[PDB]
Design a protein around this nucleic acid. Structure first.
Ligand SMILES: [Mg+2]
Ligand SMILES: [Mg+2]
Ligand SMILES: [Mg+2]
Ligand SMILES: [Mg+2]
Ligand SMILES: [Mg+2]
Ligand SMILES: [Mg+2]
Ligand SMILES: [Mg+2]
Ligand SMILES: [Mg+2]
Ligand SMILES: [Mg+2]
Ligand SMILES: [Mg+2]
Ligand SMILES: [Mg+2]
Ligand SMILES: [Mg+2]
Ligand SMILES: [Mg+2]
Ligand SMILES: [Mg+2]
Ligand SMILES: [Mg+2]
Ligand SMILES: [Mg+2]
Ligand SMILES: [Mg+2]
Ligand SMILES: [Mg+2]
Ligand SMILES: [Mg+2]
Ligand SMILES: [Mg+2]
Ligand SMILES: [Mg+2]
Ligand SMILES: [Mg+2]
Lengths: 50, 122, 52
RNA sequence: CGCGACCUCAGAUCAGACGUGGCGACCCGCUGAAUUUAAGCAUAUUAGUCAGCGGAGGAGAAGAAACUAACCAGGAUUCCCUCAGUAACGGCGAGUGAACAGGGAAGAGCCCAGCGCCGAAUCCCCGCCCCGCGGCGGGGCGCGGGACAUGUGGCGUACGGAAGACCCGCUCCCCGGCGCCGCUCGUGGGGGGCCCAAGUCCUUCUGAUCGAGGCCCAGCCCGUGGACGGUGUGAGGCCGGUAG
RNA sequence: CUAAGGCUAAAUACCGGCACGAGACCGAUAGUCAACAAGUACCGUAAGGGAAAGUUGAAAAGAACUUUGAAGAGAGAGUUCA
RNA sequence: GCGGGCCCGGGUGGAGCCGCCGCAGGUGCAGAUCUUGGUGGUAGUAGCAAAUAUUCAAACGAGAACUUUGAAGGCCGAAGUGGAGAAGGGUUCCAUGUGAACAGCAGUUGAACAUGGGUCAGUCGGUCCUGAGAGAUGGGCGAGCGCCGUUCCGAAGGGACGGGCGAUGGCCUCCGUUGCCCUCGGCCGAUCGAAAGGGAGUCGGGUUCAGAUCCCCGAAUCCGGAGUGGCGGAGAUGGGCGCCGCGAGGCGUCCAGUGCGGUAACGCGACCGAUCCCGGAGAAGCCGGCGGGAGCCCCGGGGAGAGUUCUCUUUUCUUUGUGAA
RNA sequence: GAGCUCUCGCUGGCCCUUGAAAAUCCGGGGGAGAGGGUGUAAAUCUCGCGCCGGGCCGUACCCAUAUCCGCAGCAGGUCUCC
RNA sequence: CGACUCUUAGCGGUGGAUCACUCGGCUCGUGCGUCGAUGAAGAACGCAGCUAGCUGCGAGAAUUAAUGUGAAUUGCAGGACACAUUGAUCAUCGACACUUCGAACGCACUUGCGGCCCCGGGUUCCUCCCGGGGCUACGCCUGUCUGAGCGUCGCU
């Protein structure tokens, strides 16, 4: 909106930082059952209904 | 290079502050090296320096609070952080002196008619 | 604050600052441009701190 | 024209404390229906129930008769069985519906106001000294303050009480510290940590035995230990444990 | 019996909390919605609604290397009792 | 074996299973427009037809109708298919790389995926003010969470000047601060409420792959502080009297001196002043007509660059300026 | 040049419609008080310069026959300037 | 003998039914039975060398101190440690520490505006300015101080 508040900007920054994929070296751990992030958020669907 | 609390217990306050300043300078340099590529050996020192800073600050705080509660030991009124902190209800509990307190009537009754030991069938 | 940034830079790197421009990056971190006085050179202090 | 007491009433970033919210299975105080049944439905029933509000603890509430009974009487409160689907209530329809006594679990009794006698004999706060002070107490020293006679404390409360008269035998209970011996029932009270038996025996299957056969008596050893789990299958004896 | 004043533990209750034990109970469409990054992903402005999803192998020993193809994909070879 | 079903043979499978005597049950499916999951015919079928339109050559590339470059032909035709914002979105923005999946064909392309990078303010806005309204205290009601109401059943301003006292601090000269005493004092309800209302003050050039009235360069401006006033200038250096000196001028004394000019409207760089009172600005509807200024368009020319020139055309096309203060 | 747009200024017409508040700034009426006393001072709603500071938050991009809402790159909807 | 179609069988596809496994549920029972203004429950934002989620933690931020045990953690490097040394990891946890909202407490919720004291930068307290530290909510009890009343009285 280019007129966002500080709280909204912090929320968007945290979501953007969380949107990254899972690192590869996690898969090499002994007790690992995770194959992909499965929580990736795209900006076309799942429009983050603030 | 290992920092242990045993040596830090006896050191003076100014020496501990200087050591803390040196450790913070080293941590800043380690961050600068981290953002400039650096190396695995340099990057592994970040945790060591952070834990050394934590140890120095813990020693400082423990010594300061021990001295402060030594100063207030005996005063009727003490700072809130130095007061015992058990629970909200337990601090509202009775003083343990009023529980043992008995009225003159109760003391008269107990003194005049104490509970006695007895046996039957003999 | 910008005053705090100016004083911190002055105390750390033994430098005098002309002005500071700050912004909040779209990741949660604060980015500050520290303008150096004409007496000192940014390249020299950058070499001294290690970045190049 | 002002000052000095008292009574009512305000201000405080005045000194020291207290309440606010959360959980809410169980508990206490209010408010509080309609689905449903009556083969319809309005009293009834659903139901002092759900929904809503407030308030605590480890339990809460209740509790020591302005009682039950009518008997040759019982005797605080709480819970179990029975009383009893009974007395009773109810378009006397559908339906609703206790209490007493009896047998048990447990069992504990008490305190004020008033009435009156003691020189307020009473209580709170601030200063100093001594002890311990991490659930801030005890004693002493303060013509240092305040509360209180519009009533504090001692005796004393329905089971009677107070004071004298003079009959009888006589004088240990509680609180705060200083340390000490017995480790105090699941047969050493609670919490934590480290440990305590015996085949990897001989052949033979298998990728791998913990399988099969055999070994001074079902076989070799332990057994107050033959639960369990792990170990490349199905292990009392490989390992942790198990019993004590 | 002596109301219009007050206190009191025990026998009682405990689908929440802390730490344990057990089962003629279910065995991944069952059993709590949730055996798994589950009150998560996701939906609605909101009060709220709310999943699907366990299994290589004893041991990754997870297929070196050669060959066709741009690659996805194959043909040989190798590991493993498989 | 009438049957419910059962016993053997073969293959796969790799770790538990069954008979008999009794006990117990969440114990037998073909249907419930049953619940969940999967799979067929339809079917390589309907369809990939709203808004005029593409073609040639080259490059990268394994691969080109869809990418890029150049040329040609077109459309949107300044109420645009152009250039910028508000709400909303939230990294979709920029650079590089891949072509697993998506972009209902394809793709060497993408708003896809993976790495990194990017948002710079006294002057642009929030922040300040109040509007419609919302909502505490006082007060009242309510079993209660709370509700009514915003001046109504309030000891509602903790502020200020001048004077006095007391104290400290700083060359206790001089001043500040704080405390007390006297004195002065209407407001009108705490507070919230507009990124389009009110609200002082910044523009020009350059600059990035992506930011610039924000960065750099150059010119300004607003608010606040300014004590010891940093300076100059205004209050300012007038007259009379008694002397000295040829005179300019110098000395002593009395005073005036909080400015000056114009008949006037008003003007000159300033040109003491409190509690108090008055006024103005902020601060205003819609519509018509006319006039001034600017930007753009139009015409006659000069230059500079340029398409046509098979005939004509002193040719047609583009440009030809200066910020705030 | 009744040329288009913006702006400034006059002049009218309409209302049983009369078309915002506050913050903030300024001018004026008074003289409570101050000044030094004949070269100086108190004052300058500060006349011209000179010195110091201005903190916090937003700033990318789309803004629509593809970056928003309609389950989507949906012939729909969505407030403005040149 | 063709193609297509129908039944059966072998093999190969889609699918995940059945069986066997289970660090998960359901039910009953035992003991204990503890939140918060010294700041609860909950929420937000951050913390790892490489770290998205889960879990853990709070600028001392994948944990500090102390105690017990005693040679590791591990997906890779790096390594601290000499494991003849309080000594790696673990468990316990009694010391210390514990960002922002939230009963949430200077006023509102924008992370915007303030007042009262102290210290430092600037000063040589001089007020502007900057940084740091401690306070500033409501109700209520006891007590203190300062007050009002044509409330009831006493002296002058
Ligand atoms: Mg959309
Ligand atoms: Mg008594
Ligand atoms: Mg009926
Ligand atoms: Mg019926
Ligand atoms: Mg009916
Ligand atoms: Mg009833
Ligand atoms: Mg009671
Ligand atoms: Mg009874
Ligand atoms: Mg009967
Ligand atoms: Mg009495
Ligand atoms: Mg086993
Ligand atoms: Mg075994
Ligand atoms: Mg053993
Ligand atoms: Mg399930
Ligand atoms: Mg067709
Ligand atoms: Mg057309
Ligand atoms: Mg456009
Ligand atoms: Mg792009
Ligand atoms: Mg396609
Ligand atoms: Mg406002
Ligand atoms: Mg922009
Ligand atoms: Mg389209």
């Amino acid at each position: 909106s280019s007129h966002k508040t500080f709280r909204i900007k912090r929320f968007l920054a945290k979501k953007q930082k969380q949107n990254r994929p899972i690192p590869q070296w996690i898969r090499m751990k002994t007790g690992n059952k995770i194959r992909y992030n499965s929580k990736r958020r795209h900006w076309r669907r799942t429009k983050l209904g603030l | 290079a290992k920092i242990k609390a045993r040596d830090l217990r006896g050191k003076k306050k100014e020496e501990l502050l200087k050591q803390l300043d040196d450790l913070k300078v080293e941590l800043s340099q380690l961050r600068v090296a981290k953002v400039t590529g650096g190396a695995a050996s340099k990057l592994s020192k970040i945790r060591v320096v952070r834990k050394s800073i934590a140890r120095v600050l813990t020693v400082i705080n423990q010594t300061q609070k021990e001295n402060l509660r030594k100063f207030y030991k005996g005063k009727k009124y003490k700072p809130l952080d130095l007061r015992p902190k058990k629970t909200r209800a337990m601090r509202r509990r009775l003083n343990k002196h009023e529980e043992s307190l008995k009225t003159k009537k109760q003391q008269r009754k107990e003194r005049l008619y104490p509970l006695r030991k007895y046996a039957v069938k003999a | 604050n910008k005053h705090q940034i100016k004083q911190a830079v002055k105390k750390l790197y033994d430098i005098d600052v002309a002005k500071v421009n700050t912004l909040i990056r779209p990741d949660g971190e604060k980015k500050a441009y520290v303008r150096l006085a004409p007496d000192y050179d940014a390249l020299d202090v950058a070499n001294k701190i290690g970045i190049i």
